[model samples]
Target: MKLDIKKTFSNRSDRVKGIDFHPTEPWVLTTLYSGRVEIWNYETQVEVRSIQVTETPVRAGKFIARKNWIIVGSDDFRIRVFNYNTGEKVVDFEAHPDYIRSIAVHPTKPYVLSGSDDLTVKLWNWENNWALEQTFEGHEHFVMCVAFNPKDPSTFASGCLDRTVKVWSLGQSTPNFTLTTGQERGVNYVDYYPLPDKPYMITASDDLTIKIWDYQTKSCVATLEGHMSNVSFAVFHPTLPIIISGSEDGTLKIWNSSTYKVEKTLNVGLERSWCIATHPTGRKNYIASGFDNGFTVLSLGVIHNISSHED
Candidate 1:
Protein backbone atom coordinates (compact mmCIF):
# COMPACT_ATOMS: atom_id res chain seq x y z
CA MET A 1 0.00 0.00 0.00
CA LYS A 2 1.10 3.58 -0.70
CA LEU A 3 0.53 6.60 1.49
CA ASP A 4 -0.52 10.03 0.24
CA ILE A 5 0.42 13.17 2.17
CA LYS A 6 -2.95 14.68 2.81
CA LYS A 7 -1.85 17.67 4.89
CA THR A 8 0.96 19.17 6.94
CA PHE A 9 1.05 21.70 9.80
CA SER A 10 3.93 23.67 11.20
CA ASN A 11 4.37 25.83 14.29
CA ARG A 12 7.18 28.23 15.14
CA SER A 13 9.79 27.18 17.74
CA ASP A 14 7.98 24.06 18.90
CA ARG A 15 9.10 20.43 18.73
CA VAL A 16 6.46 17.75 18.86
CA LYS A 17 6.50 15.34 21.77
CA GLY A 18 3.19 13.54 21.14
CA ILE A 19 0.38 13.40 18.60
CA ASP A 20 -3.21 12.12 18.81
CA PHE A 21 -6.16 12.16 16.43
CA HIS A 22 -9.60 13.29 17.43
CA PRO A 23 -12.06 10.38 17.52
CA THR A 24 -14.81 11.95 15.44
CA GLU A 25 -13.50 15.32 14.33
CA PRO A 26 -11.24 16.33 11.47
CA TRP A 27 -8.68 17.49 14.05
CA VAL A 28 -5.30 16.39 15.35
CA LEU A 29 -3.93 17.07 18.85
CA THR A 30 -0.23 17.67 19.37
CA THR A 31 1.85 18.19 22.50
CA LEU A 32 4.99 20.23 22.05
CA TYR A 33 8.34 20.29 23.76
CA SER A 34 8.20 24.09 23.61
CA GLY A 35 5.27 24.01 26.03
CA ARG A 36 2.17 24.29 23.91
CA VAL A 37 -0.75 22.02 23.06
CA GLU A 38 -2.34 22.52 19.65
CA ILE A 39 -5.35 21.16 17.80
CA TRP A 40 -5.64 21.61 14.08
CA ASN A 41 -8.43 20.92 11.62
CA TYR A 42 -6.67 18.99 8.89
CA GLU A 43 -9.69 18.89 6.61
CA THR A 44 -10.07 22.65 6.71
CA GLN A 45 -6.27 23.20 6.57
CA VAL A 46 -6.66 25.55 9.50
CA GLU A 47 -5.52 25.61 13.09
CA VAL A 48 -8.58 25.20 15.22
CA ARG A 49 -6.94 26.15 18.53
CA SER A 50 -3.59 26.40 20.21
CA ILE A 51 -3.44 26.47 24.01
CA GLN A 52 -0.32 27.54 25.83
CA VAL A 53 -0.38 24.91 28.56
CA THR A 54 2.87 25.82 30.28
CA GLU A 55 6.27 27.42 30.01
CA THR A 56 7.84 23.95 29.98
CA PRO A 57 7.44 21.06 27.57
CA VAL A 58 4.09 19.31 27.46
CA ARG A 59 5.26 15.77 26.78
CA ALA A 60 1.96 13.97 26.30
CA GLY A 61 -1.56 15.01 25.38
CA LYS A 62 -4.84 13.31 24.37
CA PHE A 63 -8.43 14.13 23.66
CA ILE A 64 -10.87 12.80 26.23
CA ALA A 65 -13.78 12.99 23.81
CA ARG A 66 -16.30 11.67 26.26
CA LYS A 67 -15.67 14.68 28.45
CA ASN A 68 -15.00 17.09 25.59
CA TRP A 69 -11.59 17.84 27.12
CA ILE A 70 -7.98 17.81 26.03
CA ILE A 71 -5.63 16.48 28.71
CA VAL A 72 -1.88 16.85 28.92
CA GLY A 73 1.05 15.66 30.99
CA SER A 74 4.16 17.79 31.35
CA ASP A 75 7.85 17.76 32.17
CA ASP A 76 6.74 19.88 35.11
CA PHE A 77 5.28 16.78 36.79
CA ARG A 78 1.75 18.11 36.37
CA ILE A 79 -1.31 16.87 34.51
CA ARG A 80 -3.82 19.36 33.20
CA VAL A 81 -7.15 19.11 31.43
CA PHE A 82 -8.64 21.77 29.19
CA ASN A 83 -11.92 22.27 27.45
CA TYR A 84 -11.35 21.28 23.82
CA ASN A 85 -13.63 23.82 22.17
CA THR A 86 -13.43 26.69 24.68
CA GLY A 87 -9.71 26.29 25.46
CA GLU A 88 -10.38 26.68 29.16
CA LYS A 89 -8.03 25.04 31.64
CA VAL A 90 -10.50 23.08 33.68
CA VAL A 91 -8.21 20.81 35.69
CA ASP A 92 -4.65 21.23 36.87
CA PHE A 93 -2.86 19.15 39.46
CA GLU A 94 0.65 18.07 40.37
CA ALA A 95 0.11 14.48 39.35
CA HIS A 96 3.52 12.98 39.48
CA PRO A 97 6.57 13.51 41.67
CA ASP A 98 8.74 13.34 38.57
CA TYR A 99 8.27 14.13 34.88
CA ILE A 100 5.01 12.82 33.48
CA ARG A 101 5.80 11.04 30.25
CA SER A 102 2.47 9.65 29.01
CA ILE A 103 -1.25 9.76 29.69
CA ALA A 104 -3.63 6.96 28.59
CA VAL A 105 -7.38 7.17 28.75
CA HIS A 106 -9.32 3.96 29.24
CA PRO A 107 -11.77 3.23 26.42
CA THR A 108 -14.95 2.61 28.34
CA LYS A 109 -13.85 3.37 31.86
CA PRO A 110 -13.74 6.70 33.63
CA TYR A 111 -10.08 6.11 34.50
CA VAL A 112 -6.90 7.81 33.28
CA LEU A 113 -3.41 6.39 33.53
CA SER A 114 -0.25 8.47 33.71
CA GLY A 115 3.29 7.12 33.61
CA SER A 116 6.23 9.11 34.87
CA ASP A 117 9.98 9.32 35.41
CA ASP A 118 9.23 8.56 39.03
CA LEU A 119 8.89 4.87 38.01
CA THR A 120 5.25 4.82 38.97
CA VAL A 121 2.02 4.60 37.00
CA LYS A 122 -0.94 6.44 38.44
CA LEU A 123 -4.55 5.50 37.92
CA TRP A 124 -6.96 8.36 38.45
CA ASN A 125 -10.73 8.38 38.73
CA TRP A 126 -11.70 11.24 36.46
CA GLU A 127 -15.34 10.50 36.97
CA ASN A 128 -14.97 11.30 40.64
CA ASN A 129 -13.29 14.67 40.21
CA TRP A 130 -9.95 13.15 39.14
CA ALA A 131 -9.36 11.38 42.41
CA LEU A 132 -6.23 9.36 42.96
CA GLU A 133 -7.51 5.81 42.90
CA GLN A 134 -4.30 3.80 42.75
CA THR A 135 -0.56 4.05 42.31
CA PHE A 136 1.25 1.24 40.44
CA GLU A 137 4.86 0.87 41.48
CA GLY A 138 7.09 -1.80 39.98
CA HIS A 139 9.25 -0.67 37.11
CA GLU A 140 12.88 -0.16 38.10
CA HIS A 141 13.50 2.84 35.84
CA PHE A 142 11.48 5.61 34.22
CA VAL A 143 8.02 4.57 33.05
CA MET A 144 8.20 5.88 29.50
CA CYS A 145 4.75 4.87 28.31
CA VAL A 146 1.52 3.26 29.41
CA ALA A 147 -1.30 1.80 27.33
CA PHE A 148 -4.72 0.26 27.81
CA ASN A 149 -5.01 -3.11 26.13
CA PRO A 150 -7.20 -2.65 23.07
CA LYS A 151 -8.80 -6.07 23.29
CA ASP A 152 -9.22 -6.09 27.03
CA PRO A 153 -9.80 -2.85 28.84
CA SER A 154 -9.56 -4.30 32.36
CA THR A 155 -5.80 -4.69 32.06
CA PHE A 156 -2.92 -2.53 30.82
CA ALA A 157 0.78 -2.55 30.03
CA SER A 158 3.71 -0.23 30.70
CA GLY A 159 7.05 0.13 28.98
CA CYS A 160 9.97 1.33 31.03
CA LEU A 161 13.59 2.35 30.63
CA ASP A 162 14.28 -0.73 32.69
CA ARG A 163 14.18 -2.79 29.48
CA THR A 164 10.90 -4.44 30.25
CA VAL A 165 7.20 -4.24 29.49
CA LYS A 166 4.88 -5.30 32.28
CA VAL A 167 1.22 -6.15 31.87
CA TRP A 168 -1.03 -5.51 34.83
CA SER A 169 -4.54 -6.08 36.06
CA LEU A 170 -6.62 -3.19 37.29
CA GLY A 171 -6.70 -2.55 41.05
CA GLN A 172 -3.53 -4.56 41.42
CA SER A 173 -0.15 -3.12 42.20
CA THR A 174 1.84 -5.98 40.64
CA PRO A 175 2.23 -7.07 37.06
CA ASN A 176 0.58 -10.22 35.82
CA PHE A 177 3.60 -10.96 33.67
CA THR A 178 6.65 -9.21 32.28
CA LEU A 179 8.16 -9.11 28.78
CA THR A 180 11.92 -8.70 28.75
CA THR A 181 13.84 -7.71 25.64
CA GLY A 182 16.89 -9.71 26.70
CA GLN A 183 19.59 -7.38 25.25
CA GLU A 184 17.68 -4.28 24.32
CA ARG A 185 18.87 -0.94 25.70
CA GLY A 186 15.40 -0.17 26.97
CA VAL A 187 11.75 -0.13 26.10
CA ASN A 188 10.31 3.16 24.84
CA TYR A 189 6.72 2.33 24.00
CA VAL A 190 4.22 -0.52 24.18
CA ASP A 191 1.01 -1.02 22.21
CA TYR A 192 -1.60 -3.71 21.68
CA TYR A 193 -2.75 -5.07 18.35
CA PRO A 194 -6.16 -3.56 17.55
CA LEU A 195 -8.08 -6.77 17.09
CA PRO A 196 -8.95 -9.23 19.84
CA ASP A 197 -8.37 -12.44 17.90
CA LYS A 198 -4.66 -11.70 17.47
CA PRO A 199 -3.62 -11.65 21.13
CA TYR A 200 -0.48 -9.73 20.29
CA MET A 201 1.49 -6.69 21.49
CA ILE A 202 4.20 -4.52 19.97
CA THR A 203 7.09 -2.74 21.63
CA ALA A 204 9.37 0.02 20.38
CA SER A 205 12.91 -0.15 21.74
CA ASP A 206 15.96 1.98 22.35
CA ASP A 207 17.90 -0.90 20.85
CA LEU A 208 16.58 0.14 17.42
CA THR A 209 14.10 -2.68 16.94
CA ILE A 210 10.39 -3.36 17.12
CA LYS A 211 9.05 -6.72 18.26
CA ILE A 212 5.65 -8.19 17.80
CA TRP A 213 4.83 -10.60 20.63
CA ASP A 214 2.14 -13.15 21.11
CA TYR A 215 1.14 -12.09 24.61
CA GLN A 216 -0.83 -15.24 25.17
CA THR A 217 2.22 -17.41 24.58
CA LYS A 218 4.66 -14.78 25.86
CA SER A 219 6.88 -15.18 22.80
CA CYS A 220 7.92 -12.97 19.95
CA VAL A 221 6.51 -13.78 16.54
CA ALA A 222 8.18 -11.08 14.49
CA THR A 223 11.29 -8.93 14.96
CA LEU A 224 11.49 -5.82 12.76
CA GLU A 225 14.74 -3.95 12.28
CA GLY A 226 15.52 -1.01 10.00
CA HIS A 227 15.57 2.24 11.96
CA MET A 228 19.02 3.76 12.44
CA SER A 229 18.37 4.92 15.97
CA ASN A 230 16.01 4.45 18.85
CA VAL A 231 12.52 3.49 17.77
CA SER A 232 10.29 5.88 19.67
CA PHE A 233 6.87 4.53 18.84
CA ALA A 234 5.25 1.60 17.01
CA VAL A 235 1.68 0.47 16.38
CA PHE A 236 -0.20 -1.99 14.21
CA HIS A 237 -2.40 -0.28 11.65
CA PRO A 238 -5.94 -0.76 12.96
CA THR A 239 -7.29 -2.74 10.05
CA LEU A 240 -4.35 -3.33 7.76
CA PRO A 241 -1.52 -5.83 7.53
CA ILE A 242 0.91 -3.00 8.24
CA ILE A 243 3.00 -1.82 11.16
CA ILE A 244 4.18 1.77 11.51
CA SER A 245 7.07 3.08 13.57
CA GLY A 246 8.68 6.47 14.17
CA SER A 247 12.31 6.73 15.12
CA GLU A 248 14.64 9.29 16.59
CA ASP A 249 16.73 8.62 13.51
CA GLY A 250 14.35 10.98 11.63
CA THR A 251 12.28 8.44 9.74
CA LEU A 252 8.83 6.93 9.77
CA LYS A 253 8.81 3.34 8.56
CA ILE A 254 6.07 1.22 7.12
CA TRP A 255 6.37 -2.53 7.49
CA ASN A 256 4.60 -5.50 5.97
CA SER A 257 3.22 -7.29 9.00
CA SER A 258 3.02 -10.71 7.44
CA THR A 259 6.50 -10.67 5.94
CA TYR A 260 8.05 -8.68 8.82
CA LYS A 261 10.06 -6.48 6.48
CA VAL A 262 10.11 -2.71 6.11
CA GLU A 263 8.34 -1.71 2.90
CA LYS A 264 8.95 2.02 2.95
CA THR A 265 11.03 4.67 4.70
CA LEU A 266 9.91 8.28 4.77
CA ASN A 267 12.31 10.94 6.03
CA VAL A 268 11.14 13.76 8.28
CA GLY A 269 13.66 16.32 7.00
CA LEU A 270 15.93 17.63 9.79
CA GLU A 271 14.23 16.65 12.99
CA ARG A 272 13.68 13.36 14.77
CA SER A 273 10.38 11.62 14.30
CA TRP A 274 8.80 10.96 17.69
CA CYS A 275 5.21 9.76 17.61
CA ILE A 276 2.35 8.64 15.35
CA ALA A 277 -1.41 8.39 15.75
CA THR A 278 -4.22 6.44 14.10
CA HIS A 279 -7.79 7.62 14.29
CA PRO A 280 -9.66 5.73 17.00
CA THR A 281 -13.12 6.63 15.78
CA GLY A 282 -13.00 3.54 13.51
CA ARG A 283 -11.69 5.66 10.64
CA LYS A 284 -8.91 3.16 9.89
CA ASN A 285 -6.96 4.75 7.06
CA TYR A 286 -6.17 8.24 8.32
CA ILE A 287 -2.84 8.61 10.12
CA ALA A 288 -0.99 11.42 11.87
CA SER A 289 2.78 11.38 12.20
CA GLY A 290 4.72 13.74 14.48
CA PHE A 291 8.14 15.01 13.60
CA ASP A 292 10.13 17.56 15.66
CA ASN A 293 7.96 20.66 15.45
CA GLY A 294 5.27 19.67 13.02
CA PHE A 295 2.92 16.87 11.92
CA THR A 296 1.64 15.33 8.73
CA VAL A 297 -1.59 13.60 7.83
CA LEU A 298 -1.41 10.65 5.46
CA SER A 299 -4.06 8.69 3.61
CA LEU A 300 -3.73 5.05 2.65
CA GLY A 301 -6.90 4.84 0.61
CA VAL A 302 -9.82 2.55 1.09
CA ILE A 303 -11.00 -0.17 3.42
CA HIS A 304 -14.17 -2.18 3.20
CA ASN A 305 -16.07 -3.36 6.25
CA ILE A 306 -16.10 -7.13 6.35
CA SER A 307 -19.76 -7.87 5.95
CA SER A 308 -19.38 -11.30 7.58
CA HIS A 309 -17.12 -11.33 10.70
CA GLU A 310 -18.89 -13.09 13.52
CA ASP A 311 -19.05 -11.07 16.67
Candidate 2:
Protein backbone atom coordinates (compact mmCIF):
# COMPACT_ATOMS: atom_id res chain seq x y z
CA MET A 1 0.00 0.00 0.00
CA LYS A 2 3.08 2.26 0.16
CA LEU A 3 6.02 2.94 -2.17
CA ASP A 4 9.55 2.25 -0.99
CA ILE A 5 11.77 4.47 -3.13
CA LYS A 6 13.97 1.55 -4.17
CA LYS A 7 16.67 3.63 -5.91
CA THR A 8 17.11 6.54 -8.30
CA PHE A 9 19.06 7.20 -11.54
CA SER A 10 20.01 10.76 -12.60
CA ASN A 11 22.95 10.71 -14.95
CA ARG A 12 20.93 12.69 -17.47
CA SER A 13 20.39 16.41 -17.01
CA ASP A 14 16.83 16.24 -18.35
CA ARG A 15 13.81 14.04 -17.84
CA VAL A 16 13.96 10.41 -18.80
CA LYS A 17 11.22 9.34 -21.18
CA GLY A 18 10.82 5.61 -20.65
CA ILE A 19 11.51 2.60 -18.38
CA ASP A 20 10.90 -1.11 -19.03
CA PHE A 21 11.24 -4.31 -16.96
CA HIS A 22 13.22 -7.22 -18.24
CA PRO A 23 11.08 -10.21 -19.24
CA THR A 24 12.72 -12.66 -16.85
CA GLU A 25 15.13 -10.90 -14.54
CA PRO A 26 15.44 -8.21 -11.88
CA TRP A 27 16.74 -5.77 -14.47
CA VAL A 28 15.24 -2.62 -16.02
CA LEU A 29 15.99 -0.83 -19.28
CA THR A 30 15.87 2.95 -19.38
CA THR A 31 16.42 5.75 -21.92
CA LEU A 32 17.84 9.08 -20.83
CA TYR A 33 17.97 12.50 -22.47
CA SER A 34 21.59 11.93 -23.43
CA GLY A 35 20.59 9.25 -25.96
CA ARG A 36 21.93 6.43 -23.82
CA VAL A 37 20.27 3.12 -23.00
CA GLU A 38 21.01 1.75 -19.54
CA ILE A 39 20.30 -1.60 -17.93
CA TRP A 40 20.05 -1.60 -14.18
CA ASN A 41 19.81 -4.25 -11.52
CA TYR A 42 17.06 -2.70 -9.45
CA GLU A 43 17.69 -4.67 -6.29
CA THR A 44 21.33 -3.72 -6.06
CA GLN A 45 20.77 -0.23 -7.44
CA VAL A 46 23.62 -0.79 -9.87
CA GLU A 47 24.01 -0.11 -13.56
CA VAL A 48 24.69 -3.49 -15.12
CA ARG A 49 25.31 -2.38 -18.70
CA SER A 50 24.99 0.69 -20.91
CA ILE A 51 24.83 1.45 -24.63
CA GLN A 52 25.19 4.81 -26.35
CA VAL A 53 23.02 5.80 -29.32
CA THR A 54 23.14 8.76 -31.67
CA GLU A 55 19.47 9.40 -30.91
CA THR A 56 19.24 12.02 -28.23
CA PRO A 57 16.13 12.05 -26.03
CA VAL A 58 15.01 8.54 -26.70
CA ARG A 59 11.33 8.45 -25.84
CA ALA A 60 10.18 4.86 -25.82
CA GLY A 61 11.70 1.47 -24.99
CA LYS A 62 10.86 -2.26 -24.67
CA PHE A 63 12.61 -5.56 -23.94
CA ILE A 64 12.23 -8.24 -26.56
CA ALA A 65 10.49 -11.52 -25.73
CA ARG A 66 13.81 -13.25 -25.32
CA LYS A 67 14.98 -10.83 -22.59
CA ASN A 68 18.40 -10.82 -24.24
CA TRP A 69 17.63 -7.80 -26.42
CA ILE A 70 16.02 -4.34 -26.24
CA ILE A 71 14.21 -2.06 -28.71
CA VAL A 72 13.38 1.60 -28.47
CA GLY A 73 12.23 4.64 -30.51
CA SER A 74 13.55 8.15 -30.16
CA ASP A 75 12.80 11.82 -30.73
CA ASP A 76 15.27 11.52 -33.61
CA PHE A 77 12.71 9.35 -35.39
CA ARG A 78 14.66 6.12 -35.25
CA ILE A 79 14.09 2.64 -33.84
CA ARG A 80 17.12 0.66 -32.72
CA VAL A 81 17.29 -2.89 -31.48
CA PHE A 82 20.22 -3.98 -29.34
CA ASN A 83 21.40 -6.90 -27.27
CA TYR A 84 21.14 -5.80 -23.67
CA ASN A 85 23.29 -8.64 -22.40
CA THR A 86 26.15 -7.98 -24.77
CA GLY A 87 25.96 -4.24 -25.47
CA GLU A 88 25.70 -4.90 -29.21
CA LYS A 89 23.43 -3.11 -31.69
CA VAL A 90 21.26 -5.65 -33.45
CA VAL A 91 19.37 -3.42 -35.84
CA ASP A 92 19.01 0.29 -36.52
CA PHE A 93 16.33 1.91 -38.70
CA GLU A 94 14.48 5.19 -39.17
CA ALA A 95 10.93 5.07 -37.92
CA HIS A 96 9.45 8.39 -39.00
CA PRO A 97 10.13 11.60 -40.83
CA ASP A 98 9.78 13.34 -37.49
CA TYR A 99 9.49 12.47 -33.79
CA ILE A 100 8.63 8.95 -32.66
CA ARG A 101 6.76 9.00 -29.37
CA SER A 102 6.22 5.38 -28.41
CA ILE A 103 6.97 1.79 -29.35
CA ALA A 104 5.71 -1.68 -28.40
CA VAL A 105 6.70 -5.30 -28.86
CA HIS A 106 4.06 -7.87 -29.71
CA PRO A 107 3.52 -9.86 -26.47
CA THR A 108 4.32 -13.16 -28.09
CA LYS A 109 5.79 -12.54 -31.50
CA PRO A 110 8.83 -11.31 -33.40
CA TYR A 111 7.01 -8.14 -34.32
CA VAL A 112 7.84 -4.51 -33.34
CA LEU A 113 5.34 -1.62 -33.45
CA SER A 114 5.75 2.14 -33.06
CA GLY A 115 3.79 5.45 -33.29
CA SER A 116 5.15 8.75 -34.51
CA ASP A 117 4.51 12.48 -35.00
CA ASP A 118 3.95 11.70 -38.64
CA LEU A 119 0.58 10.26 -37.58
CA THR A 120 1.30 6.68 -38.42
CA VAL A 121 2.21 3.27 -36.95
CA LYS A 122 4.78 0.99 -38.55
CA LEU A 123 5.12 -2.75 -38.07
CA TRP A 124 8.50 -4.48 -38.25
CA ASN A 125 9.35 -8.10 -38.76
CA TRP A 126 12.12 -9.00 -36.34
CA GLU A 127 11.27 -12.68 -36.75
CA ASN A 128 13.39 -12.92 -39.83
CA ASN A 129 15.91 -10.46 -38.39
CA TRP A 130 14.30 -7.01 -38.23
CA ALA A 131 12.83 -5.93 -41.56
CA LEU A 132 10.07 -3.46 -42.35
CA GLU A 133 6.77 -5.29 -42.36
CA GLN A 134 4.36 -2.45 -43.09
CA THR A 135 3.27 1.04 -42.11
CA PHE A 136 -0.23 1.98 -40.87
CA GLU A 137 -1.67 5.43 -41.49
CA GLY A 138 -4.79 7.09 -40.07
CA HIS A 139 -4.31 9.22 -36.98
CA GLU A 140 -4.96 12.88 -37.61
CA HIS A 141 -2.18 14.07 -35.28
CA PHE A 142 0.86 12.65 -33.55
CA VAL A 143 0.45 9.00 -32.66
CA MET A 144 1.52 9.19 -29.01
CA CYS A 145 1.32 5.55 -27.96
CA VAL A 146 0.64 2.00 -29.13
CA ALA A 147 -0.17 -1.27 -27.27
CA PHE A 148 -1.05 -4.81 -28.24
CA ASN A 149 -3.86 -6.65 -26.54
CA PRO A 150 -2.12 -9.22 -24.36
CA LYS A 151 -4.73 -11.87 -24.90
CA ASP A 152 -4.92 -11.34 -28.61
CA PRO A 153 -1.68 -10.26 -30.23
CA SER A 154 -3.49 -9.66 -33.50
CA THR A 155 -5.51 -6.89 -31.81
CA PHE A 156 -4.01 -3.68 -30.34
CA ALA A 157 -4.83 -0.15 -29.27
CA SER A 158 -3.42 3.32 -29.95
CA GLY A 159 -3.94 6.79 -28.47
CA CYS A 160 -3.08 9.96 -30.31
CA LEU A 161 -3.14 13.76 -30.23
CA ASP A 162 -6.21 13.35 -32.42
CA ARG A 163 -8.17 12.70 -29.19
CA THR A 164 -9.03 9.13 -30.09
CA VAL A 165 -7.98 5.53 -29.39
CA LYS A 166 -7.62 3.19 -32.35
CA VAL A 167 -7.81 -0.59 -32.50
CA TRP A 168 -5.92 -2.48 -35.17
CA SER A 169 -5.02 -5.92 -36.41
CA LEU A 170 -1.69 -7.27 -37.62
CA GLY A 171 -2.31 -7.80 -41.31
CA GLN A 172 -4.13 -4.53 -41.94
CA SER A 173 -3.08 -1.00 -42.79
CA THR A 174 -6.21 0.66 -41.39
CA PRO A 175 -7.51 0.56 -37.83
CA ASN A 176 -10.27 -1.93 -37.31
CA PHE A 177 -12.07 0.53 -35.04
CA THR A 178 -11.76 3.75 -33.06
CA LEU A 179 -12.92 4.77 -29.56
CA THR A 180 -13.09 8.37 -28.46
CA THR A 181 -12.45 9.23 -24.79
CA GLY A 182 -14.33 12.55 -24.99
CA GLN A 183 -11.05 14.37 -24.37
CA GLU A 184 -10.70 17.80 -25.95
CA ARG A 185 -6.92 17.78 -26.33
CA GLY A 186 -5.36 14.34 -26.63
CA VAL A 187 -4.93 10.93 -25.05
CA ASN A 188 -1.34 10.25 -24.05
CA TYR A 189 -1.49 6.53 -23.38
CA VAL A 190 -3.40 3.33 -24.23
CA ASP A 191 -3.11 -0.22 -22.85
CA TYR A 192 -5.10 -3.43 -23.00
CA TYR A 193 -5.78 -5.58 -19.94
CA PRO A 194 -5.02 -9.12 -21.05
CA LEU A 195 -6.61 -10.72 -17.96
CA PRO A 196 -8.04 -13.79 -19.76
CA ASP A 197 -11.45 -13.35 -18.10
CA LYS A 198 -12.72 -9.75 -18.40
CA PRO A 199 -10.53 -8.31 -21.12
CA TYR A 200 -10.47 -4.51 -21.43
CA MET A 201 -8.34 -1.62 -22.68
CA ILE A 202 -7.87 1.85 -21.15
CA THR A 203 -6.63 5.30 -22.19
CA ALA A 204 -5.44 8.42 -20.33
CA SER A 205 -5.65 11.88 -21.87
CA ASP A 206 -4.34 15.42 -21.71
CA ASP A 207 -7.92 16.52 -21.11
CA LEU A 208 -7.44 15.23 -17.55
CA THR A 209 -9.44 12.04 -17.71
CA ILE A 210 -9.11 8.27 -17.92
CA LYS A 211 -11.53 6.11 -19.89
CA ILE A 212 -11.88 2.35 -19.93
CA TRP A 213 -13.09 0.82 -23.18
CA ASP A 214 -14.73 -2.54 -23.44
CA TYR A 215 -13.42 -4.25 -26.54
CA GLN A 216 -16.59 -6.30 -26.94
CA THR A 217 -18.78 -3.27 -27.63
CA LYS A 218 -16.01 -1.19 -29.18
CA SER A 219 -17.21 1.60 -26.86
CA CYS A 220 -15.84 3.46 -23.86
CA VAL A 221 -17.58 2.09 -20.79
CA ALA A 222 -16.37 4.41 -18.04
CA THR A 223 -14.43 7.58 -17.33
CA LEU A 224 -12.57 8.84 -14.24
CA GLU A 225 -11.82 12.54 -14.06
CA GLY A 226 -10.18 14.76 -11.43
CA HIS A 227 -6.59 15.76 -12.13
CA MET A 228 -6.17 19.42 -13.11
CA SER A 229 -3.32 18.68 -15.50
CA ASN A 230 -2.69 16.47 -18.51
CA VAL A 231 -2.52 12.72 -18.07
CA SER A 232 0.79 11.56 -19.55
CA PHE A 233 1.38 8.00 -18.46
CA ALA A 234 -0.87 5.03 -17.67
CA VAL A 235 -0.88 1.21 -17.47
CA PHE A 236 -3.15 -1.59 -16.27
CA HIS A 237 -2.47 -4.06 -13.47
CA PRO A 238 -1.03 -7.15 -15.13
CA THR A 239 -3.43 -9.56 -13.40
CA LEU A 240 -6.14 -7.39 -11.92
CA PRO A 241 -9.02 -5.15 -12.96
CA ILE A 242 -7.16 -1.92 -12.20
CA ILE A 243 -5.35 0.88 -13.99
CA ILE A 244 -2.72 3.42 -12.95
CA SER A 245 -2.19 6.83 -14.54
CA GLY A 246 0.49 9.50 -14.02
CA SER A 247 -0.15 13.09 -14.95
CA GLU A 248 1.44 16.47 -15.37
CA ASP A 249 -0.42 17.20 -12.13
CA GLY A 250 2.39 15.38 -10.26
CA THR A 251 0.37 12.38 -9.09
CA LEU A 252 -0.12 8.78 -10.08
CA LYS A 253 -3.70 7.62 -9.58
CA ILE A 254 -4.81 4.02 -9.47
CA TRP A 255 -8.30 3.36 -10.83
CA ASN A 256 -10.71 0.49 -10.53
CA SER A 257 -11.20 -0.80 -14.03
CA SER A 258 -14.54 -2.42 -13.25
CA THR A 259 -16.07 0.71 -11.71
CA TYR A 260 -13.81 3.34 -13.21
CA LYS A 261 -13.12 4.98 -9.85
CA VAL A 262 -9.87 6.33 -8.44
CA GLU A 263 -8.57 3.70 -6.07
CA LYS A 264 -5.34 5.34 -4.88
CA THR A 265 -2.79 7.97 -5.78
CA LEU A 266 1.02 7.86 -5.57
CA ASN A 267 2.73 11.23 -5.37
CA VAL A 268 5.48 11.25 -8.00
CA GLY A 269 7.89 13.99 -6.74
CA LEU A 270 7.78 16.05 -9.92
CA GLU A 271 5.21 17.98 -11.96
CA ARG A 272 5.51 15.53 -14.82
CA SER A 273 5.32 11.78 -14.64
CA TRP A 274 6.19 10.72 -18.19
CA CYS A 275 6.15 6.93 -18.39
CA ILE A 276 5.23 3.83 -16.32
CA ALA A 277 6.01 0.14 -16.49
CA THR A 278 4.92 -3.03 -14.74
CA HIS A 279 7.48 -5.66 -13.86
CA PRO A 280 7.19 -8.44 -16.42
CA THR A 281 8.71 -11.06 -14.11
CA GLY A 282 5.91 -10.49 -11.58
CA ARG A 283 8.34 -11.05 -8.71
CA LYS A 284 7.14 -7.97 -6.90
CA ASN A 285 4.67 -6.62 -9.40
CA TYR A 286 6.70 -3.39 -9.30
CA ILE A 287 5.52 -0.30 -11.14
CA ALA A 288 8.18 2.16 -12.25
CA SER A 289 7.61 5.88 -12.76
CA GLY A 290 9.75 8.21 -14.86
CA PHE A 291 9.40 11.62 -13.26
CA ASP A 292 10.91 14.94 -14.28
CA ASN A 293 13.16 14.77 -11.23
CA GLY A 294 14.28 11.22 -12.02
CA PHE A 295 12.79 7.73 -11.70
CA THR A 296 11.33 5.65 -8.83
CA VAL A 297 9.71 2.28 -8.30
CA LEU A 298 6.31 1.64 -6.71
CA SER A 299 5.65 -1.89 -5.63
CA LEU A 300 2.14 -3.33 -5.73
CA GLY A 301 3.13 -6.43 -3.86
CA VAL A 302 6.10 -7.35 -1.65
CA ILE A 303 9.67 -7.51 -2.91
CA HIS A 304 9.93 -11.12 -3.99
CA ASN A 305 12.43 -13.56 -2.50
CA ILE A 306 13.12 -16.86 -4.14
CA SER A 307 16.00 -19.07 -5.08
CA SER A 308 16.98 -19.43 -8.71
CA HIS A 309 14.50 -16.76 -9.80
CA GLU A 310 16.98 -15.05 -12.04
CA ASP A 311 17.71 -16.61 -15.42
Best-performing candidate as measured by TM-score: 1
RMSD of each: 4.4, 5.3
List the candidates' TM-scores in order.
0.93, 0.89
* Candidate 1 Cα misplacement greater than 4 A, ranges: 1-13, 282-284, 302-311
Q: After superposition, how far is residue 40 of candidate 2 from its true place, in Å?
A: 1.1
CA lDDT of each candidate? 0.85, 0.77
- Model 2 residue 285 CA deviation (Å) reads 1.7
66-118 per-residue lDDT for model 1 (tens digits): 88998999988899999987878888999998899889999998999999999
Clash total of candidate 2: 0
TM-score of 2: 0.89
Write down the worst ten-residue block by lDDT for model 2: 1-10
As a whole number from 0 to 100, the lDDT of residue 268 in candidate 1 is 53
